[PDB]
């Protein structure tokens, strides 16, 4: 298939699928090169006709329609979304420079704790990205370190390429099968903040299993962070986020105002 | 590039 500069980013013909980078239940993400300018992009192909029914497909296109409208320097940008070759193809901003999962495992391998100054520098950006999504009535639905990308310049980019077989951060609303809400993203955010400081999930176990996990979540049983290295503000914020009741969790604006204030004084 | 700078420009904190 031949190139068409008239169409721009809104046709598959103008892209070269370099490699696969993610695989979901309904989609597959690729690294591709925009043939028009040579700039590399992420290309997501969602199988809305073959893997989905009418309802799921309607909901999916509605979700993408709102997501393509998001514009924040800390949120992976959507360039295009079009139906071609019986799929919904999304042209996304590429962030190959690394992530927070990679950063955590690096400090873990080097047997070092991430300094609180550093924790807030990345965390404030993650809150900024999420404040924007929530303000435009959009849930992330999977906040985990692997989805918090870091560009070479140190800029955070919140994306999505994601006996257990459950989400990364199990929540009370998942155990009760109650459904995901904006306050579900707050639980994840509180867990992620803890993981930055502890170098492990709050409900991680050397020999972790479903029974033990549910017991720990019911009781909100996580080892407290060293007060010698991490401030009472950092520990209080984790504590008010990791709360069983979604309605008692703070909204993102509140988390974001705390991180802005904390970043400002720790730096 | 960020990770090489982050490890070098960070306080050495131990883990028990």
Author numbering:
A (entry chain A): 20 to 181, 196 to 300
B (entry chain C): 810 to 825
Paper quotes:
Nek6, Nek7 and Nek9 contribute to mitotic spindle assembly during early mitosis with the microtubule motor protein Eg5 and heat shock protein Hsp72 as substrates of Nek6, and the centrosome-associated NEDD1 protein a substrate of Nek9. Nek6 and Nek7 are also substrates of Nek9 that are activated through phosphorylation of key residues within their activation loops. Nek6 and Nek7 are closely related proteins that comprises a highly conserved catalytic domain preceded by a short divergent N-terminal extension (NTE) that determines their distinct substrate preference. The non-catalytic CTD of Nek9 provides a second and alternative mechanism of Nek6 and Nek7 activation through binding and allosteric relief of an autoinhibited state31.
Molecular replacement using Nek7WT as a search model revealed two chains of Nek7Y97F in the asymmetric unit. Additional electron density was observed on the surface of Nek7Y97F at the same position on both chains. This was modelled as residues 810–825 (chain C) and 810–818 (chain D) of Nek9, bound to chains A and B of Nek7Y97F, respectively. The crystal structure of the Nek7Y97F–Nek9810–828 complex revealed a binding site on the C-lobe of Nek7Y97F, within a groove formed by the hinge region, αD, αE and β6/β7. In the structure of the complex, residues Nek9 810–818 form an α-helix. A set of hydrophobic residues (Trp811, Leu812 and Leu816) that were shown by co-precipitation assay to be crucial for the interaction are on one face of the helix and fit into the groove on the surface of Nek7, burying their side chains. On closer inspection of the Nek7Y97F–Nek9810–828 crystal structure, it was evident that the two Nek7 molecules present in the asymmetric unit formed a back-to-back dimer conformation centred around residue 97, in which the ATP binding pockets of the protomers face outwards, away from each other. The back-to-back interface is almost exclusively formed from interactions between the N-lobes, involving residues within the NTE (aa 24–29), β2-β3 loop (aa 55–58), αC-helix (aa 81, 84–88), αC-β4 loop (aa 89–92, 96) and β4-strand (aa 97, 98). Chain A of Nek7Y97F bound to Nek9810–828 closely resembles the original Nek7 structure. Phe97 is in the ‘down' position, and thus the αC-helix is stabilized in a similar position to that observed in the original Nek7 structure. In contrast, there are several notable conformational changes in chain B of Nek7Y97F bound to Nek9810–828.
